[PDB]
Design a protein around this ligand. Structure first.
Ligand SMILES: *[C@@H]1O[C@H](CO)[C@@H](O[C@@H]2O[C@H](CO)[C@@H](O[C@@H]3O[C@H](CO)[C@@H](O)[C@H](O)[C@H]3NC(C)=O)[C@H](O)[C@H]2NC(C)=O)[C@H](O)[C@H]1NC(C)=O
Lengths: 49, 263, 98, 105, 53
């Protein structure tokens, strides 16, 4: 689960495939300006430390 | 050997994006801060400016300074860089778009050089901390104590451990182009670059040209001042508009790999 | 820890750009309209609602993932070892792994 | 603001002696716990984007001397919202904050 | 400040020096400020001189 431990789950380091339940939800940029709201849980590897 | 990463240097340009609280408010700074990484332990953060400092436009001296002013670069001296946070940080090294700097903890990150006529800084939110590795929860690295396996970024550039995609820029706005031909709105070109043009009225519809005029519309504020200037790729910032044509090449390394230094 | 290494969004100036679900890990992408994107010259797309912005972001391993990374395991019992010294008898030495 | 007489908000008139000195603003520094960001000046008055700080610490540089001034004042920046940040982000919802203008009119 | 961080500028180079040291400033008094005010009562603090003699 996103936020919980193992939000990112790669088999190994080389493994291009993985499982990323991060609850990554993009939001629209504000007031006619170029940027990318990415609303996301900081990792369950950030916590767990 | 500062001459081993012309992958980035020759082929990448100092990108310009939208800084969020650029002194006053949201400007478009060339040093627009993305990808703050307060994830190591050694008081260090690796940062990406959209600006590509390092060598000049051409070939010399990492310790010079090329950001974008106008459509154009300005490859000059680094004289008065300032990364800072809650306190002023300490630079560690720059390479490419990217700088490493020893910072204290800080709720934010706040970056900026001094061109000389203007402060011209850029600032951003990012949760920063520095736990040292160990069962001691310091706030700062001491002079002494045991060494043990911390996580930390390098000083160096001769680095390939990862590479981030860096394909083209999309277009950019430049309404300095759209002058007036004494009654009609008049576009020009940088150097023969590819200017993508039409207005709300019906006139020239693509724009792949030298300096055109505009038969139909008159107002500067209803026209397509664009610069397809893809002679140099960019970092693929979220604050970039896509180059709609293609995923061009430009796979480009990262210098500041996280390494297993013993802090 | 992830890195939301955002691919640079598309901005179509007058009309929609439908997104597709690319196979990147956790490829989050959502079309957006109703922009007027200030980019270095004020805005640049001359429409005002047909200005479209397609944001896309996928998850990717950090560079620290290679080096600073937790690591799960399904752990069975295996087989225990030892560098048993015997300073035997009058032999007086063997330091062997067993 | 303007000089003694008539020109250019971005110049700098303080008192040296009994006298003014209506010259350039070159190296203003408001600061707190960290260096602030100027927003705008008008009259006696300056607006500046600061972080939180136990104090407030102001100063320009005439050129021969630092010549600063500092003061105590409890500062914080709660953003309006049920989130207790320490700093404004780049994104998120807009909602009715309280804030000072850029302008003079 | 959690640390202390010192430095001049020779002119060609920043050339600074920095160090760890736990710093605080309690004023003397039953008030636990973070900073000295402009006003209030005077009372016997501990402090270093301006002077050299
Ligand atoms: C074998 O069992 C022994 C149980 O005590 C241990 O072996 C010990 O190894 C040490 C290093 O080889 C020896 O220390 C050296 O001893 C000589 C003679 O006394 C001294 O001149 C040396 O200075 C000294 N070395 C140091 C660094 O001080 C021990 O003498 C020796 N033990 C005995 C009883 O002789 C080990 O537990 C085991 N050997 C292994 C596991 O390799």
């Amino acid at each position: 689960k996103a936020g919980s431990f193992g939000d990112l789950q790669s088999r190994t380091s080389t493994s291009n495939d993985l499982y990323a339940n991060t609850n990554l939800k993009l939001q629209r940029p504000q007031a006619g300006i170029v940027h990318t709201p990415f609303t996301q849980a900081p990792s369950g590897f950030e916590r767990w430390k | 050997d500062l001459d081993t990463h012309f992958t980035q240097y020759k082929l990448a340009r100092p990108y310009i994006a939208d800084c969020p609280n650029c002194g006053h408010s949201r400007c478009d700074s060339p040093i627009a801060i993305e990808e703050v990484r307060g994830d190591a332990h050694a008081g260090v953060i690796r940062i990406q400016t959209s600006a590509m400092f390092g060598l000049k436009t051409d070939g010399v001296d990492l310790a010079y300074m090329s950001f974008m002013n106008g459509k154009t670069q300005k490859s000059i001296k680094i004289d008065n860089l300032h990364v800072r946070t809650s306190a002023p940080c300490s630079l560690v090294s720059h390479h490419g778009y990217y700088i490493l700097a020893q910072c204290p903890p800080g709720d934010t990150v706040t970056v900026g050089f001094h061109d000389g006529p203007n402060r011209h800084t850029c600032t951003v939110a990012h949760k920063v901390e520095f736990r040292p590795v160990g069962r001691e929860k310091y706030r700062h690295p001491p002079e002494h104590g045991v060494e043990l396996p911390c996580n930390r970024y390098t000083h160096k550039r001769a680095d390939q451990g990862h590479y981030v995609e860096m394909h083209q820029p999309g277009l950019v706005a430049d309404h300095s182009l759209l002058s007036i031909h004494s009654a009609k709105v008049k576009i020009t070109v940088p150097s023969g670059a590819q200017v993508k043009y039409y207005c709300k009225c019906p006139d020239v519809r693509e724009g792949i040209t030298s300096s055109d005029h505009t038969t139909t519309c008159t107002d500067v504020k209803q026209c397509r001042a664009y610069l397809i200037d893809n002679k140099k790729w960019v970092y693929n910032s979220g604050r970039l508009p896509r180059g709609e044509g293609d995923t061009f090449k430009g796979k480009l390394h990262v210098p500041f790999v996280p390494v297993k230094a013993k802090c | 820890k992830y890195k939301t290494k955002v691919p640079s969004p598309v901005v179509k100036c007058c009309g929609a750009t439908q997104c597709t679900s690319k196979p990147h890990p956790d490829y989050q992408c959502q079309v957006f309209t109703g922009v007027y994107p200030f980019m270095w010259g004020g805005a640049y797309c001359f429409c005002d609602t047909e200005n479209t912005q397609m944001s896309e972001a996928y998850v990717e391993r950090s560079e620290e993932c290679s080096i600073d990374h937790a690591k799960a395991y399904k752990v069975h019992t295996g087989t225990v070892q030892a560098m048993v010294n015997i300073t035997y008898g009058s032999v007086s030495w063997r330091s062997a792994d067993v």
